[PDB]
Amino acid sequence: TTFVALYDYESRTETDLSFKKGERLQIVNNTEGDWWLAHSLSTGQTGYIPSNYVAPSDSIQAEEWYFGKITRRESERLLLNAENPRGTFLVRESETTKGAYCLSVSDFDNAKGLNVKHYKIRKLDSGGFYITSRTQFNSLQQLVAYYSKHADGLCHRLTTVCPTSKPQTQGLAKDAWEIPRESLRLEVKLGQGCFGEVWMGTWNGTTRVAIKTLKPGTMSPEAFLQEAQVMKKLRHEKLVQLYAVVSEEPIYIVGEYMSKGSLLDFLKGETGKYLRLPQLVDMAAQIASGMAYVERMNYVHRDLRAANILVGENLVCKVADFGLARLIEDNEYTARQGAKFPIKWTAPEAALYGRFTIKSDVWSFGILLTELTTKGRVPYPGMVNREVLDQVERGYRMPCPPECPESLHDLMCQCWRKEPEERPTFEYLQAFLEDYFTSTEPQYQPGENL
Ligand SMILES: O=P(O)(O)OP(=O)(O)OC[C@H]1O[C@@H](n2cnc3c(NCc4ccccc4)ncnc32)[C@H](O)[C@@H]1O
């Protein structure tokens, strides 16, 4: 019945409970969602703890080299990290077959370079596990530990577990949502948006958080609080998580600190100098993927653009500032006008009829796509805002960009089809981008290579 600490965890409040990886915890009250009241067996202290920080004793989730339900694409992301010596591996669930697992390993080919081989693990009726018929085990752990000593036909011996970062605790603490202003100390100014400022800071003198400040009058607090309610329900691997908020003006928005900055910025300068088509595409698919969930959630971003796409380690992309624009009270902006409204990204029907839907966002993504293929080049190069709606209204569209493959320009076009619902879905854009270069995310090794 005991739980085991997958990671360490510092005490943030007067009411939570610190611990070390490996530390056993009695889950003495599971009657919550993201924070469990627990009691430490070693120390014996009692307090709240972040659920995604533990797993059951003897469970598979207890295993540090088990990644759960991650996509092959994602793990490959992780594994391919340069610092990872050959043989860095992980064990996740196969998506192709329900129940089966997959052992992914980094390898190096003198003639192919670094890469990751995948080996499906089949579990027999018996209950056995095995990659190859001539060697099965009773637990993934016996399998793993085995290949940890002997390669045995695998592309290489499983040297090192795949290193990952402490994950995000949903929220700063239990019930924590509308936190006192004084609990945030703004440290570093990170950017100056049109309606506010964004700072790297600390909540309760322990946590690394990102805070957004909004100039007063910007938006109705009550409305904000209401919208925040909705936002707060959107959890996605490719969406910048929301943590807590300061409702009274100057309203504050406290979320995940993304080191690598805005994808726009990053796209230009040296950061995006050795950026190749294959990497750009990936960023796009990550974005699609995020937008895909907004779509399934039946939500609307209303301000999608490179500038609202943040970067993370391993070239990870997360969508930000979703919603907020719909709360902007600035007159001109409400009328989709003025020097502060991102018109060049706005779908016509949205500029003209304020009809903001997912389909308008698909338009936006289209533009964003060109940003990707042109190192953050402001779109509609030869047009000042004022004449853009006009032009696009009449059917004008940015031609295929320099060095952008036509297929991507055609994607773009599909995103700009005058008819909102002729424009493709994110679920689609996600699939399309996810397999450009003859790689449908399939192909696992056979068995004994030797
Ligand atoms: O809308 P624009 O003007 O592009 O500018 P902002 O609304 O400030 O957002 C993007 C700019 O601010 C910085 N920035 C924004 N967010 C972050 C961030 N974490 C996400 C987050 C922060 C605050 C509240 C919830 C989530 N980590 C690091 N830098 C960030 C960027 O460098 C960019 O210049």
Side-chain angles (χ1 to χ4, degrees), residues 1-339 341-450:
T1 26
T2 44
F3 282 78
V4 62
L6 300 172
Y7 316 91
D8 284 297
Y9 172 78
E10 255 299 314
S11 170
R12 296 183 191 156
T13 80
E14 200 84 22
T15 44
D16 53 352
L17 154 71
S18 302
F19 58 82
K20 163 82 164 54
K21 175 175 181 169
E23 188 159 339
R24 275 148 29 83
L25 301 155
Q26 212 48 285
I27 288 302
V28 323
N29 201 332
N30 33 25
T31 84
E32 294 104 328
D34 303 319
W35 294 70
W36 302 336
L37 190 41
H39 185 204
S40 165
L41 298 168
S42 357
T43 77
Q45 307 291 330
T46 66
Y48 285 101
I49 65 115
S51 47
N52 62 145
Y53 264 44
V54 292
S57 300
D58 272 342
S59 71
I60 191 57
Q61 278 75 30
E63 298 295 339
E64 163 197 35
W65 45 243
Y66 178 66
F67 272 69
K69 184 262 194 298
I70 162 179
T71 67
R72 160 197 284 242
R73 171 51 67 116
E74 287 312 294
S75 53
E76 287 205 335
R77 181 176 312 282
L78 294 200
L79 301 177
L80 271 353
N81 186 105
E83 307 195 327
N84 298 5
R86 262 97 271 212
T88 303
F89 70 111
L90 67 86
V91 159
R92 51 175 185 94
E93 309 168 5
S94 190
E95 311 154 297
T96 39
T97 315
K98 244 50 58 199
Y101 297 79
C102 189
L103 174 50
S104 303
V105 171
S106 49
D107 214 43
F108 177 84
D109 205 299
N110 68 158
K112 215 163 69 194
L114 191 66
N115 68 88
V116 178
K117 311 288 227 290
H118 303 253
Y119 302 94
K120 198 176 262 180
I121 289 152
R122 296 259 170 188
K123 184 198 164 177
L124 315 163
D125 333 273
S126 335
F129 286 119
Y130 76 101
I131 296 186
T132 172
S133 311
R134 59 97 162 146
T135 339
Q136 13 183 103
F137 322 71
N138 317 84
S139 75
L140 265 23
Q141 35 266 289
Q142 266 144 175
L143 185 151
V144 179
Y146 180 68
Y147 298 95
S148 296
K149 308 180 296 245
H150 323 283
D152 268 78
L154 291 188
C155 38
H156 184 293
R157 175 190 63 80
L158 314 170
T159 85
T160 321
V161 159
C162 192
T164 185
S165 35
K166 280 182 200 180
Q168 307 271 270
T169 62
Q170 293 310 272
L172 305 173
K174 189 205 180 46
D175 292 316
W177 171 235
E178 275 166 73
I179 65 188
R181 184 177 305 268
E182 60 262 41
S183 72
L184 292 174
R185 15 219 102 49
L186 323 178
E187 304 170 328
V188 169
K189 198 169 179 307
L190 295 171
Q192 236 228 277
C194 240
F195 301 81
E197 313 202 295
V198 154
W199 288 75
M200 177 191 84
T202 306
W203 178 65
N204 226 25
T206 61
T207 323
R208 159 92 314 109
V209 300
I211 310 119
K212 169 178 282 220
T213 58
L214 291 318
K215 180 133 191 310
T218 290
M219 48 174 56
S220 139
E222 31 278 310
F224 168 68
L225 242 173
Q226 179 169 73
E227 187 54 19
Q229 287 317 309
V230 185
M231 317 197 239
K232 186 199 167 196
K233 317 173 183 187
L234 292 188
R235 1 86 264 166
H236 194 253
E237 128 124 66
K238 306 296 192 190
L239 291 181
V240 163
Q241 194 199 326
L242 196 58
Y243 285 136
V245 307
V246 170
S247 294
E248 328 154 75
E249 303 211 297
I251 301 175
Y252 278 14
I253 320 182
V254 182
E256 83 172 295
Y257 168 69
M258 302 275 284
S259 55
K260 292 164 124 188
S262 120
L263 168 61
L264 178 53
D265 273 340
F266 180 116
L267 216 24
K268 44 247 264 274
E270 69 158 28
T271 36
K273 103 144 297 300
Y274 282 136
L275 259 176
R276 304 297 178 186
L277 219 214
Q279 286 110 262
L280 290 171
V281 173
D282 177 75
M283 283 124 100
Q286 279 190 64
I287 302 185
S289 180
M291 291 312 282
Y293 157 104
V294 179
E295 192 195 55
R296 290 186 298 271
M297 287 305 283
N298 262 74
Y299 189 77
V300 194
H301 193 303
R302 270 202 43 148
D303 188 12
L304 172 69
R305 47 180 163 121
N308 290 329
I309 302 300
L310 286 183
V311 199
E313 261 68 71
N314 271 327
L315 231 47
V316 149
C317 281
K318 298 179 172 212
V319 181
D321 287 318
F322 38 81
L324 292 203
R326 185 190 74 80
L327 305 108
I328 303 303
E329 292 178 307
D330 172 74
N331 301 94
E332 291 190 302
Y333 194 83
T334 319
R336 292 82 70 205
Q337 289 157 19
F341 186 82
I343 189 59
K344 300 200 186 189
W345 289 263
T346 324
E349 68 253 37
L352 299 159
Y353 321 133
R355 274 159 46 205
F356 298 104
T357 70
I358 192 56
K359 289 309 205 202
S360 61
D361 271 338
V362 175
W363 179 281
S364 290
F365 181 84
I367 316 301
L368 201 150
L369 269 196
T370 67
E371 277 172 302
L372 269 194
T373 49
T374 67
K375 305 163 274 295
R377 200 156 295 141
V378 171
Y380 298 127
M383 300 170 48
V384 48
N385 287 3
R386 49 182 184 68
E387 59 181 296
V388 189
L389 212 199
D390 232 60
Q391 289 278 21
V392 297
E393 184 192 60
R394 301 187 298 106
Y396 173 68
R397 297 303 191 260
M398 274 181 309
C400 181
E403 307 301 310
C404 163
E406 188 55 73
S407 315
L408 277 185
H409 183 241
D410 194 57
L411 189 62
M412 292 165 208
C413 285
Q414 288 180 68
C415 286
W416 302 329
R417 276 156 163 172
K418 184 183 72 149
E419 275 319 296
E421 314 205 14
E422 199 161 320
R423 271 116 78 156
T425 46
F426 277 123
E427 180 212 18
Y428 169 69
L429 283 176
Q430 196 188 338
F432 178 86
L433 304 166
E434 243 161 43
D435 328 82
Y436 204 91
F437 319 95
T438 48
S439 56
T440 56
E441 256 62 79
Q443 177 109 247
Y444 297 53
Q445 250 45 95
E448 57 285 297
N449 98 117
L450 269 191

